[PDB]
Structure 1
Amino acid sequence: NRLPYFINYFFDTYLLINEDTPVGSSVTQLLARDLDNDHLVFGVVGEEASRFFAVESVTGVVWLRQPLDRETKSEFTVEFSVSDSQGVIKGTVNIQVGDVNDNAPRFHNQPYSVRIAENTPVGTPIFIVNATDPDQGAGGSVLYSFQPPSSFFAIDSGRGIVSVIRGLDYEITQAYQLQVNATDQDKSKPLSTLANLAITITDVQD
């Protein structure tokens, strides 16, 4: 009696599952060959595997039980089983959760407040802002801008540096309530968030 064996590509390489996959969704179908043409029955082995993947006994279709996330867990290995009526064969399948852009940039220590004198020289960096993004590639890289734009302050798109660009005057304007806007470079469906930045201006002699 000749034992059964798997054939699918994802026993040598890896199986990709995009993290947006609704639960109850089929992820693949396990395919095996018995040389003696036995009606094979498939299963899922382990408890790590079994709380993620349910396997249709006969068809070898594999579907998703608990939802996926790459922010939590990027990759993990799972072991599947196929029966010969007398003997179980199992094989190691490296899963890899495929990323999507489901995280808008997240600020740290907002709101923001700065205090500078009217005489602050033009080009003086006065604050630095930081927004993180955990996503993959352009989903997880940030670009800072003002919103609306400002005439008196700029912000470095790369490093999030708030510099002075037009000279200030206390007798004209004693405060400036700006909104820093952080955005990710995912060209198809991008995300963006806002932080308040309240620059108070201090009087001097003129």
Structure 2
Amino acid sequence: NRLPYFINYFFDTYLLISEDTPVGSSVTQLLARDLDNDPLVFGVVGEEASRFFAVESETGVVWLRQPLDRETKSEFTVEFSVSDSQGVIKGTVNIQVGDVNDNAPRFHNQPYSVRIPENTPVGTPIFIVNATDPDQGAGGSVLYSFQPPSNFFAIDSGRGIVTVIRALDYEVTQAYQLQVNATDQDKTKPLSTLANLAITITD
């Protein structure tokens, strides 16, 4: 009797599963050969592995049994079994959880309030806004803007630095209420968040 062995590429590399994979989805089919042509039985081995995955024992089809979230657990290690009813073989698979853009930017250091004197020159940086996005790639990269755009202030798209771009006047306007939009850069479905910025003029 010779022991059966696993075929799939991912026993030697890794298996990618998207974090948006519906629970119940088949994520792969285990494949194995036996030089004796013995009928084969497949299994999943371990407590964490047996919560995440079920295996159809006669076909090797693997089902996801719990939702994934890359931002909570990005990778884990699982053991599958194959058996010819005389011996049992185990293979380890590294599971990588594939990222989707399922986070909108999150602001820190709120509320956002600044007092500036009315003599503040054009080009003066007055306040820094801060938003982060825990997604990977472009979906994790944030650009800042004013919604709607201001004639009196600008905000750096990259760094979130607010500047004065036209001279102020305490007489005309003693306060400004701005909306900072933070958008991620995903090509297909970008997500955005608005944050309040309060600017008070002194004299």
Q: TM-score, normalised by structure 2?
A: 0.98
Distance 1:137 1:52 in 2: 26
Distance 2:196 2:111 in 1: 5
Give per-residue Cα distances to partners, 1:132-191, cap 9 Å, x unaligned. Answer: 000010011110000000000000001000010100001111110000000011111100
Q: How much has 1:110 moved relative to structure 2?
A: 2.4
**Segments of 4+ moved more than 3 angstroms:** none
Secondary structure of 2:78's match? Answer: strand
Q: How much has 1:77 moved relative to structure 2?
A: 1.1
Q: How much has 1:98 moved relative to structure 2?
A: 0.5
Question: Are 1:98 and 2:98 counterparts?
Answer: yes
Secondary structure of 2:51's match? Answer: coil
Give per-residue Cα distances to partners, 1:28-77, cap 9 Å, x unaligned. Answer: 00000011111101000011111101111111000101110110111111
Distance 2:2 2:16 in 1: 31
Q: How much has 1:111 moved relative to structure 2?
A: 2.6
RMSD: 0.9
Secondary structure of 1:59's match? Answer: coil
Distance 1:140 1:185 in 2: 7
Distance 1:37 1:126 in 2: 75
Name the structure 1 match of 2:153. Answer: 153
* Residues paired across the two proteins, number: 203
Secondary structure of 1:123's match? Answer: coil
Distance 2:179 2:16 in 1: 39
Question: Are 1:59 and 2:63 counterparts?
Answer: no
Give the percent of matched residue pairs that are identical in Structure 1 and Structure 2: 96
Secondary structure of 1:50's match? Answer: helix
Distance 2:110 2:143 in 1: 17
Distance 1:33 1:19 in 2: 31
Gaps of 5+ in 2: none
Output aligned runs, 1:8-19, within 5 Å.
8-19=8-19
Distance 2:42 2:172 in 1: 77
Name the structure 2 match of 1:169. Answer: 169
Distance 1:68 1:140 in 2: 18
Q: How much has 1:120 moved relative to structure 2?
A: 0.8
Gaps of 5+ in 1: none
Output aligned runs, 1:125-164, within 5 Å.
125-164=125-164
Distance 1:52 1:106 in 2: 29
Secondary structure of 2:10's match? Answer: helix
Q: How much has 1:85 moved relative to structure 2?
A: 0.6
Distance 1:190 1:54 in 2: 34
